[PDB]
């Protein structure tokens, strides 16, 4: 138990963490696995939570003692998976059973340093959905009875993982969209670390392969004379999604100049072009424009304006943008680059995915600490940006 | 079970139906409960009668005499729960089938709990019908939850006049449907959530006669197609300005995924060029406005599914292949630009 | 090994799989107003001639039923009428008269200690069929789908707004086939059977009526049979008009492109009006061929046969692609008195064809139009 | 109690009914008020069920003894209403109380020949919504204990009157749309009469005034040189609604010929015009067309086609239609007049509202008995109709 | 009560607020439960404080000191249920106010049942606040269910800096808003279900300068307006072919009822003609395509409502008047054609 204490006399944490060979997974947990703690991994079914936990477990079995409890898959099924992933000549125990009373008995017997519950939805107890909240409460008290690290898996369902977020020590989300081949592990709530930490992984035939240096993916993905491509750090609620805007500006041949968007609001693009013609001075009147959000990402947020203006200008001008620079900003009809919400989160996320510059609205920076790995350029007008970029 | 070390972990009854065996993960395990779900009329009784005649069948849904007429077209096959339990102890049957488990519906949950304990009392395989396997429309049987196998396994059948006939080569469905060198058809390995669906994109490019060039799609997003054509004209060099274009997703499949772009581009080009594509080659890839063929999700599943359905080539994005094992039965061609693809294809 | 009771109505017998099986529960479902009471009064006045009928219902009064049932049949025979509701008062009369056939005119209007409880009453009715070995008919107004799994035979009396046919189909039959149908037409007297339905399709058609064609489409699993209508006429004005009602506009637009590019019809300068007769929505790939044939029929000014129908998705290469549920569609066409049916040739692999209909497998649109015109 | 009886020996009804001064209300009940019976009056709130029952009650109090039970309005409120409506120097008893036990006691005391429950929703009992089904069951048994006629009121709500329809003797519906100034009382289920019977009433400042001779309303409503007006007997589910289609065909002055509909599907009208031009021979190519469903009635049923074709033709031709003739029929693209559902109900409803002709599809008439008060003309083609009409 | 013969059926506390008295059907009856409903912020506490200072106020929602500051701007006025009941027997107050009745919400139903029995124990008038009268947005107080009065009664108030000020002549709201002979404005007595709303239709007819004539509506159905103009051109004889038309429902009232046709026709004509309408005259009537002014529902209510809000004329359809008593304060003009109306109006 803990006691009310004066803040000046609150002593700094002196924990002993357990690191895994996966540098990324360690950063996320804020150094490594803290013993006597409850970590929830959330995400859509199929993303690879079981796969990530099997990989962590085969690594942790080398220094501690792992008990992997799954009601979801059978014991034989896991053996076929886990041999591809790692080495299991070590103290890694597997238990394909679902009732907590039958689990508790095995925790006292083998006394395992690390416990993994593959699918909390598939664990029962007296008194498969409501009763998840009561099982996780009993699991947090179980972390103190035996002083063990416990991992909980939460599949994110259509209706009835976000419920347990407030009552666990660490909350991780494993998310990886149809458009990206890569899956990201983010800390939403961390009691033993920072929440701005991220771990990038790519699922390959073996299992999850870490992506240290992601700046190389964006550079491989760009062609030689790329032009009309630009990058925006947008938001899907609170998740900062990083997206590519594409533009093909080409002179009209026919009567009417064509305008066609996919993934961006058409009218938003129409205004952007008016502001580029009237403020930036681009003769777009007689130019066709095709615009696309790469990936099929819907881009419906004011912050995407600057990236789309830069994309268009890049195609019009036939001058490429840098693939490690990105742009954030609402564009006003006077050419101004207006403020946007969550600027600190967007700059953080850009830096972590290996970006070197980020153009942001100048007003958004008032008293914000900037990460040393990325050049934050505050801009005020569209002319200023295009001058800087081209 | 008790917990067990992973260094210390490791037989079934097969039927003549190779497909049904794969789904159950090798064959029928003697001590479990298998649920077959699906819409009424699909053939869950028909499939279970066929498995049973190969391998105690209990039905309230149809009469005894009705089943005899069915099952002859399709040995020790024997045809409420208290009256059933008494016959399970007497005959001691290795396989038990309950044709329709269906306040009975509130009691259905309590009957299946008692059936799982019955599988342990007398070590028997028990099949339950629910109007975890799912039989849904060719016809497909897929494993949603499998304790003794993989969930990615699928069994393709076709209901005929006799009963359900298994399907080995589903490539021959598109090949019969292909006419004598018919242009503007192409194939994509798309996804309906996680199920990889294989679909045909169709294009009719023809010169405009009057005034404005027409563009009409059915099953594909119109604007997606519009951009594809701009990229084919500006990057690939096809003069499509004065050409009408009609596009169709064969089957009435909705194709709303970035991966379909390349197949649509190839379809259009094929019709424009009047040069056909191969019916055993398929295409997967998002097409960028620079002509690039961008990466797509679930590439390993798509290549797997193409190979299994008897395809010989598959054009994929080149970047997607990093450290992925390729099946020996299919030629995976990684491409980077649309020009590269059309050069290879035509 | 069974002894059934036939009625004078050939159709109603086929549906039950030969006739009325004694000691059985038959549920007749449908909307209110279709004629379940009327059909059961007609069967009862016929069955009273060989057995003993007890007609129970509280939905209508005794005096009301007498006025109805004299128009329908003869009532000098052992036909007993009982306008009561609660069960216990019914059971007492079943033991007394010992009737071979029992009819309950609305299960919704019967009580035992009146919808939830309906499930418990029908359970007690099925055990009543064993105690006395009698055939019992139950009526279920559709507001019926709850009792379908716990009765011996399930019949549905259905009638879409466009056809004045009233079709009786067996959804679940323990003593017969489920494919069986009984076609009736409600007239001023009551329900008149339609034994030759082939003659009805051959009144709805005019003399020189081009641009009409028939498709066997599907409303889920029910195969609906529908008429596609086309009016192709040369444009007078600048732009050629295209207007659909009941079909997807873009689907029709592609069909016309395929007819011009593959079949060779000069439709560029022709206006086209298309309609699904009845206000049936036709949103299924299978309707393509019928719409193509309709248009061609109007363009060509050559009529189609009214007893021929067409099923098939039309590819942009002119091909006639496969469609789902082909065996059900052929079966439904045959039963409504059709003589030909054009289907996709690939759909026929190992399917047994009914002897009453000519199934023509086709592969291209050119082939079809050649055959048709 | 009643007994199983052979149909040949079932004797004809020999009842004694009570008539009211309102000829229409009597017809609906099939002659008059049957004693020892349960009659349900349904309809939207505000239509005038209380008003109709107060009028019936003040008339029935002259020959029997009425007990009007209302939980909905107070006793004093009803007195102010009922003096405008009729005479109450007679045995008319008012009881503003809601519990059935307290009601039962007063039924045994005064022994009233007629009982009215103003709002069954506002009557309570042990064991305001579920329990309506149990109260009406107890009311049907109460009709046999004392042999009295009982009227039940059912307000038709958004969600939770149509529930009691199967367990009462007579079901009446009082309906009267925003477009008609008149309210109609129809028998949906009648154990002591025909269901095709109808009673037309018009709510005036005093209360409900009966409309005997409705043929005069349609004739007053038409102007002198009316043209382009026609009448259709459409259906709103099962209720046959009678509606007026309006057309204004006038030559185009400008470039494009205008087409504008309100209440009819535009495309349906477009096809109708094509069939009139191609089959009937009307030169509508260079004519503007404005079409309106009078009342704001949505007309979305195939049967409305013929009425719209006749409306247009009437305006084009500048020849009026008869205001006591109406038209029913789907129009095929070959000019044919196709069959429609519920033809017998439509012909009935037309006749009852004082129509003299009705053009129907010829095929729809096979073995249907036609009412003697209306001329049913079966037609086969649009040309045939326009020939007959003009 | 016991049943009683109708030949044998037949006083209240009034407040200075004439409107509030009408709503309760004369005044406050001493032995009943009155519920005031509405959205938070509307002024149910403010209205009850004003009635109370004119006529025991119980509030958990606001403190005693807070109410004193409010109620002075706006005598024997005194400021859980067991602690309340004890004070009801002591002071014996003629009027009790519960400011906010608000598992309390499950118990709310049980508290109000005990409050209705409390009205009989001590014959007192009790007001209940629910975050049957409804206070909704000028501001209106309407009686939904009244046991001691009519439900068609309404009380109009306007919240000002002091508190709620009653409104006598709501005609003066449109009259202040009317400029010096402003054309193209007209008034309709429309209906929002059963509530007769009174609304202003606005039109700007102006000659087209280029190519196509514009038509733009806000609050009225576009097509309805389009037909009205065709009828004004073909029947009334207004050359609107080459005129642009902008139409607006003032307030953002949706006007989707046939009765609004005549007001819109008169509005357009007024703008076309550049002749104003009277601001105390209003118009009700569906307009047929022959120029006829057809009947409308609820005519008696509409005429009543117009008169009460200080209107002097009302143009109604002539057929609608058959056997209806007309109020002496308003000139009801029955019309039959649109030409007749425009002749009378201009
Ligand atoms: C480890 C591994 C998994 N898989 C498949 C099997 C799994 O069911 C699927 C999804 O991974 P999984 O980790 O089970 O997803 P979840 O996030 O729902 O726990 O990936 C392979 O195909 N190959 C492999 O080597
Ligand atoms: C076996 C068989 C079935 N059928 C028909 C009868 C069945 O009602 C229908 C559907 O098959 P069934 O297996 O009964 O469907 P389910 O159990 O999924 O509801 O197929 C045939 O026509 N011929 C056959 O040979
Ligand atoms: C027998 C008969 C019925 N009818 C009417 C009376 C019935 O109430 C109506 C509808 O038939 P009914 O069989 O009662 O419909 P269901 O029982 O399916 O709801 O048909 C006639 O008009 N004439 C007749 O000769
Ligand atoms: C009798 C009468 C009613 N009314 C009003 C008061 C009623 O609340 C209203 C509606 O009639 P009512 O009969 O109460 O409608 P419901 O169908 O809901 O029972 O008509 C008058 O204005 N004047 C009258 O003379
Ligand atoms: C009486 C009064 C209220 N108010 C404000 C304070 C209240 O919070 C607000 C709303 O009135 P109130 O009657 O409290 O709203 P309700 O009871 O309907 O929720 O009006 C003033 O600003 N000045 C005043 O003189
Ligand atoms: Mg998993
Ligand atoms: Mg079955
Ligand atoms: Mg009936
Ligand atoms: Mg009332
Ligand atoms: Mg308040």
Author numbering:
A (entry chain A), D (entry chain A): 53 to 179, 186 to 218, 223 to 452
B (entry chain B), E (entry chain B): 54 to 63, 68 to 112, 119 to 137, 142 to 146, 151 to 173, 185 to 213, 233 to 238, 244 to 452
C (entry chain C): 66 to 178, 186 to 215, 223 to 452
Question: Could you share sentences copied from the article?
Answer:
We report here a detailed structural and functional analysis of the RadA protein from S. pneumoniae, which uncovers several key properties of this HR effector encoded in nearly all bacterial species and in some eukaryotes. All bacterial RadA proteins are characterized at the sequence level by three conserved domains: a potential C4-type zinc binding motif (C4); a central canonical RecA-like ATPase domain (H), including a KNRFG motif unique to and strictly conserved in RadA proteins; and a region homologous to the protease domain (P) of the bacterial Lon protein. In addition, like DnaB proteins, we show that RadA assembles into a ring-shaped hexamer and is a functional DNA helicase that loads onto ssDNA and translocates in a 3′ direction along it to unwind dsDNA. The full-length protein (RadAFL) and the P domain (RadAP) of pneumococcal RadA were purified from E. coli and shown to assemble predominantly as hexamers in solution.
The crystal structure of RadAP was solved at 2.5 Å resolution and the structure of RadAFL bound to thymidine diphosphate (dTDP) was solved at 3.5 Å resolution. The structure of RadAFL reveals three protomers per asymmetric unit, organized as annular hexameric particles with two-fold symmetry and forming a two-tiered planar ring, corresponding to the H and P domains. The C4 domain (residues 1–35), present but unresolved in the crystal structure, likely occupies the gap observed in the crystal packing and is a functional zinc finger. The central H domain and the clasp in the RadAFL structure (residues 53–274) forms a ring with two-fold symmetry, with outer and inner diameters of 100 and 25 Å, respectively. It displays a typical RecA-fold containing a nucleotide-binding site and it is, most likely, the functional core. The position and dynamics of the H domain are different in each protomer of the asymmetric unit regardless of the nucleotide bound. In the RadAFL structure obtained upon crystallization in the presence of dTTP, each protomer was occupied by a hydrolysed dTDP. The nucleotide binding site displays all the canonical residues found in an ATPase active site of the RecA ATPase family. However, no arginine finger, required for nucleotide hydrolysis was found close to this site. In the RadA crystal structure, R253 is located further away from the ATPase active site of the neighbouring protomer (11 Å) than the corresponding residue in DnaB helicases.
